[PDB]
């Protein structure tokens, strides 16, 4: 139980997320990812998963797990998904067909919206080509929609590729801002470093019970020993292997 838990804040509990075109990523590795704090965070609008069950996530092992946090409009929450299309799915954040993870989204009209207009959030709408899986494009150069050379400012034939969100609390459902957090899971030849909470139980001795110690399973009783195990040694084995 002395193992350090991975900080699940700064991604869900963060004040203001990164822009949709400039989404940031936190590398979660060499820790114990306690997903129990997620199920009681907020009334999420969507909690879909792909490849990994939402329940078995607290016990499966993964080499590296990434978390991407961004805020999009309420009517475009169905766009962030493997195989889907739209503005966000093509020019802001594209998921591959082999995406393995979960998608989390919840309402944020009381956080990322102001009466004067929360124009700090930006989203990409114009680009020469669609985004690749897990690709980022932070370029803010004026997209030349027309064949005429564009000037240093916006014009009739060229507009800024990044448009601002006019988030206002007076809007109804669908137009309110929604914070979206995407979780990505992967495994490779590198050994796994995150397996989730192990959820140990109380110790029972002098009884015929099943014991489990860091993966070693068996059946037998436990009694206080008088041995002199070394500080680095963990398992005890006799002559009979």
């Amino acid at each position: 139980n002395i193992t350090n838990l991975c900080p699940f804040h700064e991604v869900f509990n963060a004040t203001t997320f990164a822009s949709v075109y400039a989404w940031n990523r936190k590398r979660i590795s060499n820790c114990v990812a306690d997903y129990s704090v997620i199920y009681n965070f907020a009334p999420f609008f969507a909690f879909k998963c792909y490849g990994v069950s939402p329940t078995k996530l607290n016990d499966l092992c993964f080499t590296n797990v990434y978390a991407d946090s961004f805020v999009i409009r309420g009517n475009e929450v169905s766009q962030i998904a493997p195989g889907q299309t739209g503005n966000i799915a093509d020019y802001n954040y594209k998921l591959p067909d082999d995406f393995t993870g979960c998608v989390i989204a919840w309402n944020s009209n009381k956080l990322d919206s102001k009466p004067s207009g929360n124009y700090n959030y930006l989203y990409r709408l114009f680009r020469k080509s669609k985004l690749k899986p897990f690709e980022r494009d932070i370029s803010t150069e004026i997209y030349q929609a027309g064949n005429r050379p564009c000037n240093g400012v916006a014009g009739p034939n060229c507009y800024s590729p990044l448009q601002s969100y006019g988030f206002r609390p007076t809007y109804g459902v669908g137009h309110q801002p929604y914070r979206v957090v995407v979780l990505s899971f992967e495994l490779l030849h590198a050994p796994a470093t995150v397996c989730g909470p192990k959820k140990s139980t109380n110790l029972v001795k002098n009884k015929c019970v099943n014991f489990n110690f860091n993966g070693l399973t068996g059946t037998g009783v436990l009694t206080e020993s008088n041995k002199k195990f070394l500080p680095f040694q963990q398992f005890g084995r006799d002559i009979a292997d």
Epitope: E10, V11, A14, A18, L111, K114
Partner: antibody, heavy 121, light 109 residues
Framework: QMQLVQSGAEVKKPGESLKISCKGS????????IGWVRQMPGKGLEWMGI????????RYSPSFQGQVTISADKSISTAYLHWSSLKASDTAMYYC??????????????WGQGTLVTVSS | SALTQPRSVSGSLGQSVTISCTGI?????????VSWYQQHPGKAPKLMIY???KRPSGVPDRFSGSKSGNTASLTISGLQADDEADYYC?????????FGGGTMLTVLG
């Protein structure tokens, strides 16, 4: 301009659970987060919690999750303070703060004038 | 995390003074969640610095700041008579706000 004036000073014995109010005007007191800040004489500012008058959503500091509760009424644009099990060391100056359109939802854009709560025997 | 500030600082009218404050955290999406507040003696605190690259309306432009890792500082372009008050740094990156140990600015005369 937008104004946010609190109630007058009060003095009660420890354990009476007094109540302090605050009246705002000049803006829609529904779309702005409002909170309170406690400061004992000699120390710095201590934030207790905030509340969004648009709904029942409330957030409080870990050191003030159950020591103080904050409520608001959108129909009269009035915020309220309530304590439980007061002690002699609870006498301190209290300040209010609102979100405003200057910064984010957590940023305290404006402040009040302060209310002195004296708790002694 | 907890913010720290020097309890006593000194200056002079027309000169400049700096107030350091550490303990700023960083979150995914931004790292400029640093704000400062000025509290007159016996009065309510007043917002003077929030989002350091920006300033509130009605606040004099003599106030400024800078960011260097987890350390923030408050700089004043010129001290005056009304500047003799307390200053408190604040951080709001983790959806929570905390205040330092308080300061006390004095000017010669």
């Amino acid at each position: 301009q937008m104004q946010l004036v609190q109630s007058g000073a009060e003095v009660k014995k420890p354990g009476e659970s007094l109540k302090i109010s605050c009246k705002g005007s000049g803006y829609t007191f529904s779309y702005y987060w409002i909170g309170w800040v406690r400061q004992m004489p000699g120390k710095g500012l201590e934030w207790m919690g905030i509340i969004y008058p648009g709904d029942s959503d409330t957030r409080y500091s870990p050191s003030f999750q159950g020591q103080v509760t904050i409520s608001a009424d959108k129909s009269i644009s009035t915020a309220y303070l309530h304590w439980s099990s007061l002690k002699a060391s609870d006498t301190a100056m209290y300040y209010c703060a609102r979100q405003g359109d200057l910064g984010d939802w957590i940023l305290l854009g404006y402040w009040g004038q302060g209310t002195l709560v004296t708790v002694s025997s | 995390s907890a913010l720290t500030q020097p309890r006593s600082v000194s200056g002079s009218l027309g000169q400049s003074v700096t107030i350091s404050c550490t303990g700023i955290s960083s979150d995914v999406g931004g790292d400029n969640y640093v704000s400062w507040y000025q509290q007159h003696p016996g009065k309510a605190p007043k917002l003077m610095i929030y989002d350091v690259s920006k300033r509130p309306s009605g606040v004099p432009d003599r106030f400024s700041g800078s960011k260097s890792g987890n350390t923030a500082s408050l700089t004043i372009s010129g001290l005056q008579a009304d500047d003799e008050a307390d200053y408190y740094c604040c951080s709001y990156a983790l959806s929570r706000v905390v205040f330092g140990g308080g300061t006390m600015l004095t000017v010669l005369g």
